Amino acid sequence: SSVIKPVLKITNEQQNNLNVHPTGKSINAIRAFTGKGTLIWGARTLAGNDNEWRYVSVRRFFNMAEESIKKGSEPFVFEPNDANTWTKVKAMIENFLTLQWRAGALAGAKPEQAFYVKIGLNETMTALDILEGRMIVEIGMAVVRPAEFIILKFSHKMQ
Amino acid sequence: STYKTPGVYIEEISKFPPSIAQVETAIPAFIGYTQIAKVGVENFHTDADNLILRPVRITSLLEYEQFFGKAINETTIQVVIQDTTDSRGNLTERKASARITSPSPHNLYYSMQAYFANGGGPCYIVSVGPMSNTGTIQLEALQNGLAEVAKEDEVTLLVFPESQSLSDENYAALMSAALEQCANLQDRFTVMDLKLPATRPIPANAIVGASNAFRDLSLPQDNLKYGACYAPDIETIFNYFYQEDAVTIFRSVNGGAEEQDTLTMAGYNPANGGDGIQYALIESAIDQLPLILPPSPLVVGQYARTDNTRGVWKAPANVALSSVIKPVLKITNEQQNNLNVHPTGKSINAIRAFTGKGTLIWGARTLAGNDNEWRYVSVRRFFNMAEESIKKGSEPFVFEPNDANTWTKVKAMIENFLTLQWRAGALAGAKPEQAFYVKIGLNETMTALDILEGRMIVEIGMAVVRPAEFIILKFSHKMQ
Amino acid sequence: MKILYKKILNLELWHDFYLGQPNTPGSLPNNYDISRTLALVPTQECLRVLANLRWVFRPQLYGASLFANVNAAPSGQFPTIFPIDRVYRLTFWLVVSDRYFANFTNLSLINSRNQIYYFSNLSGNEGHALFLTQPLSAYTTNNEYQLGQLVTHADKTLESLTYQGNATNIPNPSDWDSLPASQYVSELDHLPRQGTYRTQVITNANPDNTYNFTLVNTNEQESWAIDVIVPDTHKSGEPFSTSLNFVGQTPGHYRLLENDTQVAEFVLVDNSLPEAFALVEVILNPELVPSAFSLLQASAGQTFIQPKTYVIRFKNRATRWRYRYEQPHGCSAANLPSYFNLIDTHTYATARPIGLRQRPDSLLNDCQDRPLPAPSITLIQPETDGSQRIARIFSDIYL
């Protein structure tokens, strides 16, 4: 909004080199389209060859989720390092991830296929870790990724 | 083609429309020569010998084209240009037509088109060597393919598209091996194509000779209930692959002699400085040549289509074929009388055209047509399905105590399955008491010796429904 | 329709927490059971392959078993319904049910959450059984052993009791125990586990070249390959990282190569069962498994079954027992069991480690001649060294 026009015009052939490059550094464009105004065109990070961190939205979502998990699992500092605390922590994390799944952020047919949480002696921890006072939690998540390219094919119908 | 800028890309191609479907009880295996056979990072045809013989699971034509690619091109297409001129030699009219004198025996890529056009689903491909221009098809390689397909459980049907080029002895040997495998596993069925004369054009009423040649083949009489046969071959709308420098040109003026020209089709290409006005006619003529295929690829697709709307116990007959122009031969009722019933029991199901209805499958009998129990295809296929399900249900009790409690549980499972089959209309009877029975026990099928050995014997009886083939109308003048 | 089945495989799992150390191992007792501590679970590929081969899986009170579908010949040999003459691969998850398992099982106490165990029939080790573990190393001179290591020497198996930076020519009897000859699980089976995405680093990245990466499984079949092109603005000689994706492979042991060179070796995982403990692999290949371990003979155009029994075994942990008090006990260095050590007026501990068992045969007596309760399996107290090494492990009993 409140825009007249961009200072330069970018073509598709230049966009090919802006969007994909062997060094992974990517440049998102702002282009004008007839009748639609000026629009943002491109949603990649500076690590565009990374299979995990290619897109902006995935990284921002991960940041949000880990921040919420940290804030949720802060109150247990200086609590007994035993099975009961582990149960409570796992419950909190799973409830948060379930709320995220049901809004359409995560893929999967049930919450069993969308995420998993591992915390315990036979999962991520040992006796040495109990003596040290360390708690280790492992969280896996499947996120949804966008479609960038649409290909149309035309033909003459047999008659 | 690479795509690096987000957006919409536009491309122009010439293609046939695609078609897919989902089935489960009609899963066929196709054994034959391929063109590339490269799966994953492995080239199955890397060395001339020691080929990788492996069955691959595919679901669409698009995947077949990914692994095994398309068929090789032909080298026999001839085109005739027909000119008619006036009294002074002025051209008044010009036409063009095409013919093929001898087509290649490698037709596996076209059969998959015909299959997916008629329905179908998941199938298995067994690439028996690479396709060759010379056209040599060997029995031993097909036998190795059939030996390898024994290791797949999802397979219920066996198809040999490239077997009409074999000799009678090799053909009989292959068919006997297939029937023996089905007899051993007791969960499969084979479909065969009748061989017809290879002369041109077809002699009047040849079907009578072909059926006598067929019945003269030596096949095991105890395995005939596991297979079926169909005739004749079908014309279809699909096109041939070719090159412009292999197409031969002829001309004829005012109905005169047909003379061969000294140029190829490539010689008329405007990119080479030829006359494009006739090049267009050559293209449009080549485009119209029909493609000849055996019935089996289409028949198996129609099996998959009909078991999904009516059930496996319904006869797969009286249904119409798609992407078909016309059959190559016309069968009459008098010939059908000898094709359908014969003292030797070997029966031939027909494919016939009926005015206004298209071309339809006509006949639903097995190669054991005089057998009171195994006369029809649908009964045998249903029995195969039922016994397979019973086996799978009664497997978990292996190495369990051989006593009355296990017998009770097994009987309960079998009776529940048979009740579900009865209520859908597969079995006859007014209640489940008149439709089936199950016998397992000491006073039913077993003895103390069998308890000591560790054997369990179960007897299952079932009444199935059978079709009506003949309708008789009688007319009269009403009294008045 | 006659269907004949015959046992074709025996898989057993041993634990000294229940068995102890027999003076010469034979079979298990008649009342053996781990059905509530360990479980074997087939994967999906395993299920469909067993279906294709017409074999049946069955859990047992000691492990599992496999049954093959055969034909009854007169010779007494049992051929399969068809010749199994290709290469096949069967995989199983090993899952733990009993909590506190890591306390009585003599495992490594070093933090490892990116590793997993692995067992196979390509390990030789055919001694008094068919062991699916790697052969134990030998006792040598001038090496470094951690507390807990099992080695072999002079027809016996040796356990380590303390840290030794340099060994002796002859075993020091105050650092090693003397058990009967058998093989167990050790750190030779702790392979790094990996998921779908990898970060691979090339050293001396040369823009004038390329690289072809490949993945090779136990059957020595290439399963995967891509290429990576270093850009032409990369100063030659620095490292270069790249991302790799193995999304379409089946879990198992693989070797990652780059241009005819092994770069890595790992067990690939798809997180179908993320909390699995170990992986077991069984192979059918007439070229890679020796004749003492194979399960199929080939003769007269057919295959015949040979039943076998494979064994895996876990050793129990050993700790020093420390008796602690609330009020002072009146026993002294002059009236306490010789095998004790008075720490202070409220505490005394054993002088050598004792092994954790469920029904410890005989208990220790007090200076006033009274049986003392055994420790519990809920807590263990390892003590780190100056160099952050494990030095001792106790079990506390509060009286």
Side-chain angles (χ1 to χ4, degrees), chain B residues 160-176:
Chain B
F160 294 95
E162 303 175 1
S163 58
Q164 291 209 291
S165 69
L166 290 160
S167 173
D168 284 343
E169 293 177 350
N170 294 342
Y171 178 80
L174 186 64
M175 294 300 103
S176 315

Side-chain angles (χ1 to χ4, degrees), chain C residues 82-338:
Chain C
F82 31 74
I84 309 171
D85 48 356
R86 286 322 179 279
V87 290
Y88 291 103
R89 184 157 64 100
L90 309 161
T91 49
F92 309 93
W93 299 119
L94 186 59
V95 193
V96 165
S97 323
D98 205 276
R99 46 160 146 264
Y100 314 148
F101 181 73
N103 286 19
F104 57 81
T105 316
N106 199 50
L107 297 173
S108 99
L109 268 194
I110 319 191
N111 184 37
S112 181
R113 66 186 183 277
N114 322 273
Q115 298 181 267
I116 187 180
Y117 285 87
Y118 178 84
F119 310 109
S120 205
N121 49 328
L122 302 188
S123 89
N125 206 336
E126 54 185 67
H128 83 94
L130 303 178
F131 293 107
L132 300 200
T133 52
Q134 299 270 55
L136 293 174
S137 62
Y139 180 86
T140 82
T141 316
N142 289 337
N143 289 337
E144 166 187 353
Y145 302 113
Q146 322 302 330
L147 158 65
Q149 209 145 326
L150 290 169
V151 308
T152 309
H153 163 91
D155 266 0
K156 310 284 279 187
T157 326
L158 289 179
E159 176 53 2
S160 171
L161 313 186
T162 189
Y163 175 79
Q164 289 116 48
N166 217 27
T168 311
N169 175 32
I170 287 309
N172 196 14
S174 68
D175 300 350
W176 305 85
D177 224 346
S178 267
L179 318 179
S182 165
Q183 314 274 316
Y184 306 88
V185 175
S186 36
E187 293 177 350
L188 295 179
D189 306 293
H190 220 184
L191 314 192
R193 86 160 80 189
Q194 180 171 347
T196 59
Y197 297 124
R198 194 178 175 89
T199 325
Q200 198 65 47
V201 192
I202 309 170
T203 38
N204 195 13
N206 289 337
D208 289 345
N209 306 128
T210 38
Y211 308 94
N212 183 254
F213 293 89
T214 44
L215 210 59
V216 181
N217 53 3
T218 56
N219 280 354
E220 293 177 350
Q221 308 158 304
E222 306 185 335
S223 270
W224 181 91
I226 70 158
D227 306 275
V228 180
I229 305 178
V230 182
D232 63 14
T233 58
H234 176 80
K235 293 179 179 179
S236 295
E238 293 177 350
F240 187 77
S241 322
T242 305
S243 155
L244 311 165
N245 194 1
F246 311 113
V247 71
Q249 311 274 309
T250 71
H253 176 288
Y254 289 83
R255 296 171 52 216
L256 174 74
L257 322 175
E258 165 201 46
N259 289 355
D260 289 345
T261 322
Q262 173 170 346
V263 194
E265 180 180 2
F266 48 70
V267 174
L268 180 96
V269 165
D270 62 2
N271 253 1
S272 35
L273 177 59
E275 63 185 342
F277 173 74
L279 187 77
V280 186
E281 208 143 19
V282 175
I283 305 171
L284 318 173
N285 189 356
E287 293 195 6
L288 295 193
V289 47
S291 280
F293 273 81
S294 58
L295 306 144
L296 298 170
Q297 283 299 314
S299 323
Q302 288 187 287
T303 57
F304 307 85
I305 75 172
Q306 326 299 323
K308 299 294 182 184
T309 178
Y310 302 160
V311 183
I312 305 179
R313 174 168 190 166
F314 299 89
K315 214 276 179 180
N316 57 28
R317 202 181 290 284
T319 68
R320 279 178 66 202
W321 299 357
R322 196 209 277 125
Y323 290 96
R324 275 200 160 116
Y325 281 83
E326 184 72 14
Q327 311 144 315
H329 64 61
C331 300
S332 180
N335 62 0
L336 62 80
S338 180

